[PDB]
Design a protein around this nucleic acid. Structure first.
Ligand SMILES: [Zn+2]
Ligand SMILES: [Zn+2]
Lengths: 247, 91, 115, 95, 76, 15
RNA sequence: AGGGAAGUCGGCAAAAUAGAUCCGUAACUUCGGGAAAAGGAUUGGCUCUAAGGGUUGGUAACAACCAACUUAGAACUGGUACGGACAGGGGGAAUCUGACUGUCUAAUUAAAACAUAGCAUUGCG
RNA sequence: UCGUGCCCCGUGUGGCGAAAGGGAAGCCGGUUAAUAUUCCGGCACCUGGAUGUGGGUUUUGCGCGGCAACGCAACUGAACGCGGAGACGACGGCGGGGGCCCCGGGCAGAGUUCUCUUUUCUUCUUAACGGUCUAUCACCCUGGAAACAGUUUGUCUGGAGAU
RNA sequence: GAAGCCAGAGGAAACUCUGGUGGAGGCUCGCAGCGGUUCUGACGUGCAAAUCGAUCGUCAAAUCUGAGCAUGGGGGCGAAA
């Protein structure tokens, strides 16, 4: 046979992500003395729409403590942030929406966003619209913090990891149906070349493992092993259960 | 003089996409295109600019809110429990 | 009466820079004239409205005209509008006075704590 | 309450509604009490507090918005700040 | 091209060194007379009503500045 | 204005 | 010419309808549509009438000046024909089928094929 | 004398890539067998470089006026920063301007003219570059509005100050 | 002829009806353009190694299109033939 679409997506070429309309990556300030020991104030000047991202971004300008310069940063906006608002990033910052605090300085039950997996990677968890990470446990002796992710997972991260207090703006985006095909086309033409998608059962045996036959059918179980060969993975991969659950 | 008995703002969609899907999308379309009272100036001039972005025409203030609503009940409960935790931590 | 016209440059496409207007010459010939793009007014760096008193030109055309025509005789003149300058003055004065009152109250509280 | 006393002031005494009229009353030194709504812009709020500090005039911070302040004054428009010039029959000055 | 509305300014422009030529346009349908002086950058013109002040000003130009009355036809 | 024009002015002064 | 599908595997092809104004329009239906449904009455020319406006000027509800295109009504009149050429829906009763708009086998197959929204499942902190 | 030395800033440190993207500046008339916004004539503009005159400022050293929006021929401004312009989708109606189309009178010319037709047709033009007077939005001063008012084809504006 | 808006008649209100305004829709007739349904079509060593005529589908968008660039054969690309 030939190289499948799944294998061809990893070479780059037409399958790379869109770049032009997307201005700056959304991440926290680098961890420094001001955030590690006290707090630093920044001014939220713009709330912008990121093409390809459902969550609005916030352009916030801070001051350089070491030189005479204004530093602009791009944060993921939480629901309630407005232009002209002073946000405070640091250890001694207050528990206000938009403030960035380490997880050791927040109480349990606090919901945070753009949470760092490791102190210094400028935010990894809970970054999409309407999502949040819940601070569910603390361990001061080991310096650890248990958090709950939007997938239902619970994870343990170092307590020096930072997170913006609040819930990411743009919630309920997926509730509205994308009535027309053009709406999905516009949604994916700003992200990457993955739309429209052709079913493998409508293909030829040269094109995909599901192709061929006088009737359109899979021909075997749709669950495929984890250690399958490259190109043998097409369908449900390493599934522990299948079917519709009653709940 | 009401022109459509039931579809309302979904009347632009014709007979297409299904009655239930038109009924579902009617709520987000109405809530999205409605005008809102500003928290900062009190004028009925807050309208959606992009998804999650709500700008006021009078005072020129831009807020981050829900996708089709100016605020979400999850964010309101977040504010409530957040001020709860602020009060507990402070005193 | 020839009323139909041609371009005068070798660009045949109706692009943004290929802008023309129709004139009638003193020889009684209906011709085109290639014109430049319209200049836009400078805007306030705080609120974004058009600054009054400053002409709307192309970026390099500003270097050919004098300084009083490119600015307004005021602090932040030709860069910010008058309302924004007034708000800056009021905000600066009020925040400095608040800092003085806060420092006096902090010194009084520190003296009371020490005593 | 504060709304009832405000309505008594409207029906009995004299007031000025608005930022510019409040500034004129504060400059004239005839303002007896300055009411500032919650949703007043903070620069205007601090400026009016500074003017009242200069004029030795009490400031009441109304917890409602300018819609609610106009409604309490009995008007169908918004009012961010206001000044009273005569208390009338109300007991609004001693509080 | 520039128009000067002052006789003394036209005189100073004529005494300027860059002035290489002066010429006179007589419009009888309009009843006016134009004195045009060619400087390096600008052609300066003065418009007058038909009177003896035109000939007085003609005398008032310097003799080094050569002056011509324009013809009826601009033949090459 | 621009550094080249300012340099022209200060070079005229220096000359 | 008369007949009007008797022709033919099969109404293939041709004919028939057609613009605009007015009367009127069923089943079904996701109430949005169907719908230009269906089925009817009219249209030339000429001579008139009526209505729909602007500028300036101390009951001005009035004077003066100026202006162009629509709309309605009436009389008269030619006739074999009046959207006089051109231009321009045939319609209806049902059944199967794909939801629709869209896309493909350049050079024999445009489709119940593909895609689509919606639905569900899987792996990953 | 300098070609030699002394400082200062140092976070960052290449090139190619569009005759439809961004971009400093030229119009008119005439001219050849064949070129012309390129030649010729007239009238301008931009960029870079020097360098004077007039005018301006200054013994209150680096202008004056207007309440203000701001104005005027000038009217010091290094390092380091801030901001604007460059610099921006598609569609719908509305309003202004140029050009084209249509109607009337007048001069000149051409055609029709059995009859009719004060007739039908043709020329009646004004560039770049400047001066001056104006041009939607917006902004400023007075003033404080419900018997709510202003106002668009389209319902927005106003005690955060409308008419 | 969808939201939004105006007026009138009701209704205690909410709302109901009527007349307007407005100009939405991967709506529709249809010119260009794009495409290629049908004809015992023309043509069949043709004008043409895929053309010509009538007819037909679509026509404000998942529409048409240029230039620069990217993907190169045990590969690519594929609304999938
Ligand atoms: Zn506001
Ligand atoms: Zn401003």
């Amino acid at each position: 046979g030939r190289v499948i679409r799944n294998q061809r997506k990893g070479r780059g070429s037409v399958f790379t992500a869109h770049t032009r309309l997307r201005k700056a990556p959304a991440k926290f300030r680098p961890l420094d003395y001001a955030e590690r020991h006290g707090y630093i104030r920044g001014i939220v000047k713009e709330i912008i729409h990121d093409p390809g991202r459902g969550a609005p971004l916030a352009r916030v300008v801070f001051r350089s403590p070491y030189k005479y310069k204004q530093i602009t940063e791009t944060f993921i906006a939480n629901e309630g942030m407005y232009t002209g608002q002073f946000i405070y990033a640091g250890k001694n910052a207050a528990l206000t929406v938009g403030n960035i605090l380490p997880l050791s300085s927040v109480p349990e039950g606090t919901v945070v966003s753009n949470v760092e997996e490791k102190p210094g990677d400028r935010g990894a968890l809970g970054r999409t619209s309407g999502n949040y990470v819940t601070v569910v446990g603390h361990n001061p002796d080991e310096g650890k913090t248990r958090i709950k992710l939007p997938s239902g997972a619970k994870k343990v991260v170092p307590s020096s990891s930072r997170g913006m207090i609040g819930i990411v703006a743009g919630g309920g985006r997926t509730d509205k149906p994308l009535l027309k095909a053009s709406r999905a086309k516009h949604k994916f033409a700003v992200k990457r070349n993955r739309w429209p998608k052709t079913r493998g059962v409508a293909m030829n045996p040269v094109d995909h493992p599901h192709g061929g036959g006088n009737h359109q059918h899979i021909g075997k179980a749709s669950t495929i092993s984890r250690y399958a060969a490259q190109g043998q993975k097409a369908g449900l991969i390493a599934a522990r259960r299948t079917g519709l659950l009653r709940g | 003089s009401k022109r459509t008995k039931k579809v309302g703002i979904s009347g632009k969609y014709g007979t297409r996409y299904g009655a239930s899907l038109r009924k579902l999308v009617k709520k987000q379309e109405v809530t999205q295109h409605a005008r809102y009272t500003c928290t900062f100036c009190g004028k009925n001039s807050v309208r959606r600019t992009a998804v999650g972005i709500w700008s006021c025409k009078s005072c020129k203030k831009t807020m981050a809110g829900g996708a089709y609503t100016v605020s979400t009940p999850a964010a309101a409960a977040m504010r409530s429990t957040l001020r709860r935790l602020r009060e507990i931590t402070e005193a | 009466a020839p009323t139909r016209v041609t371009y005068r440059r070798r660009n045949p496409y109706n692009t943004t820079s290929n802008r023309t207007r129709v004139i009638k010459t003193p020889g009684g010939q209906l011709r085109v004239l290639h014109i430049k793009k319209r200049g836009t007014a400078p805007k306030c760096g705080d609120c974004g409205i058009k600054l009054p008193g400053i002409p709307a030109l192309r970026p390099r055309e500003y270097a050919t005209i004098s300084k009083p025509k490119k600015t307004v005789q005021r602090a932040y003149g030709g860069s910010r509008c008058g309302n924004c300058v007034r708000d800056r003055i009021i905000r600066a004065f009020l925040i400095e006075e608040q800092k003085i009152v806060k420092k006096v109250l902090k010194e009084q509280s520190q003296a009371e704590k020490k005593a | 309450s504060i709304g009832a006393k405000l309505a008594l002031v409207i029906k009995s005494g004299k007031v000025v509604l608005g930022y510019r009229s409040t500034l004129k009353a504060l400059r004239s030194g005839k303002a007896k009490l300055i009411l500032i709504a919650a949703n007043t812009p903070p620069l205007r709020k601090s400026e009016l507090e500074y003017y009242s500090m200069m004029s030795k005039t009490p400031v009441h911070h109304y917890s409602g918005t300018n819609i609610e302040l106009g409604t309490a004054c009995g008007k169908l428009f918004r009012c961010s700040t206001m000044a009273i010039l005569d208390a009338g029959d109300s007991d609004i000055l001693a509080d | 091209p520039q128009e000067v509305s002052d006789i003394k300014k036209f005189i100073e422009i004529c005494r300027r060194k860059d002035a290489s030529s002066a010429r006179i346009k007589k419009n009888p349908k309009t009843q006016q007379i134009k004195f045009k002086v060619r400087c390096q950058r600008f052609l300066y013109t003065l418009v007058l009503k038909d009177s003896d002040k035109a000939e007085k000003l003609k005398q008032s130009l310097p003799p080094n500045l050569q002056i011509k009355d324009v013809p009826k036809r601009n033949k090459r | 204005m621009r550094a080249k024009w300012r340099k022209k002015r200060t070079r005229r002064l220096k000359r």
